[PDB]
Fold Mob1A.
Amino acid sequence: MEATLGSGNLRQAVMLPEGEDLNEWIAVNTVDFFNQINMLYGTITEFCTEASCPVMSAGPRYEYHWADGTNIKKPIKCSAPKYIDYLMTWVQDQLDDETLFPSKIGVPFPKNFMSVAKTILKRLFRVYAHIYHQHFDSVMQLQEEAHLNTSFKHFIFFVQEFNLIDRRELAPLQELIEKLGSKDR
Ligand SMILES: [Zn+2]
């Protein structure tokens, strides 16, 4: 596919820089994908409504109901816009949590960091899946497909590099994922 005009080599971009800490690298990248997705979803919010998306899905057979096991335990079957708002607000709350993503160098990453990072990442994946399945038309109208595709490719190379999401969670975009990159024959 076509990459954005300003993108670089994504396979190299996701590798852990020599001398850098793994937890910190995942933290920096996770913050970045949250921003990339926030940016992309923002461009199509007027096309993702209560009426266009009465439920959160990535194709009919993959429906998502929101729950975070703390504030909301009983899964909520809401519209995509509300589901994504719940989701992104939840991810942002984790990112702003000083005990999870330490703002001070004298504070180590918590023991459950990786687990929290993986949970964030698997959830962010769902926004890409909904966008591709329900709004690729609006993406094409804005002529921003390169941005969505490059961001998604970057995201997938990153999670594959560190095995951060299990294959099964990626089901709705597995075909696309298998097409990413290329066999050198
Ligand atoms: Zn939608």
About this structure: DSSP finds six helices and two strands in the chain.
